[PDB]
Design a protein around this ligand. Structure first.
Ligand SMILES: [Fe+3]
Length: 330
């Protein structure tokens, strides 16, 4: 009855131990417990789970494509929901955040410096790059190199800085964890805030999570598809796409999914949004989106018959498959 959670680097491990410890106090001795496995990146976590060294890790939907392929063969078991309990959203919006008065529109992105959440993630990579690779009559389509030559420097966490130094320009090394200050949604927004990049590819709640007062948020806007900018509150009218929720994944067979659910259900019940002043499941003095997204309000069980392809949808998986092949309509 021990769920082995795969923590990615230092901060997550810190929060995971605090997760383990607090659960120990509200769950009966015969109930599920948490064990923490620290890994270097999400990829190691996927391998560890498939190799039966850990049992669970939360992933952005785009990374669910990787966990699914053999030899990994992982499946989503618990999805995060955003918004509220009364109105649970199992999707979010990918947006392009720029500083106010920077001048460029969606079509003048070449030559800019970009800030991405991570390589392979929905909002930070799949959505934005998906939208512009084919619009490049230039067949330098083996992605990384095309992107590396499209922008004049980026921070694409988890990318290979040895073959593509340009991709790690804004964050030397392209570290794939929170140890990289420019990692994740808030890492990418910071990359723009710090003025290291001209555009951050994040989600609609990112800025709200980072800039408390409207005053500062006014120094920012969003790039829309029709080549017009708009206020950060107009994300419903100005966003790149709607993507599925981050989901906790487990092994397709012998994945301990019941235990995973009871542990998380019990956790949201005890430390969910608003629940406890002792320990918050969706926030941490040690950082943002550690283990789960700070923007989540709870967890929902994924229907048992639902596999990765059904979870992502036909359009997304195909888009992802095509993206990684540079395939573009002839
Ligand atoms: Fe995401």
């Amino acid at each position: 009855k021990t769920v082995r959670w795969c923590a990615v680097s230092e901060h997550e491990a810190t929060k995971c131990q605090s997760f383990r410890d607090h659960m120990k106090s509200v769950i009966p001795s015969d109930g599920p417990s948490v064990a923490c496995v620290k890994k270097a990146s999400y990829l190691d976590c996927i391998r560890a789970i498939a190799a039966n060294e850990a049992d669970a890790v939360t992933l952005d939907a785009g990374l669910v494509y990787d966990a699914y392929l053999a030899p990994n063969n992982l499946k989503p078991v618990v999805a995060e929901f955003y918004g509220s309990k009364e109105d649970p959203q199992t999707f979010y919006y990918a947006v392009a955040v720029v500083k106010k008065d920077s001048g460029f529109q969606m079509n003048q992105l070449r030559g800019k410096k970009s800030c991405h959440t991570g390589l392979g993630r929905s909002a930070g990579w799949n959505i934005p790059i998906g939208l512009l690779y084919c619009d490049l009559p230039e067949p330098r389509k083996p992605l990384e190199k095309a992107v590396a030559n499209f922008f004049s420097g980026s921070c694409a966490p988890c990318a290979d800085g040895t073959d593509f130094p340009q991709l790690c320009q804004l964050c030397p090394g392209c570290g794939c964890s929170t140890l990289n200050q420019y990692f994740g949604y808030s890492g990418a927004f910071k990359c723009l805030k710090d003025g290291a990049g001209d555009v951050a590819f994040v989600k609609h709640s990112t800025i709200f999570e980072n800039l408390a007062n409207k005053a500062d948020r006014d120094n920012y806007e969003l790039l829309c598809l029709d080549n017009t900018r708009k206020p950060v509150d107009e994300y419903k009218d100005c966003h790149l796409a709607q993507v599925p929720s981050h989901t906790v994944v487990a092994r397709s067979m012998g994945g301990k999914e019941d235990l995973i659910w009871e542990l998380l259900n019990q956790a949201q019940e005890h430390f969910g949004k608003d629940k406890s002043k002792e320990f918050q499941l969706f926030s941490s003095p040690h950082g943002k989106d550690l283990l789960f997204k700070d923007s989540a309000h709870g967890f929902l069980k994924v229907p048992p018959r639902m596999d990765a392809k059904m979870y992502l949808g036909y359009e997304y998986v195909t888009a992802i498959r095509n993206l990684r092949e540079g395939t573009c309509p002839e």
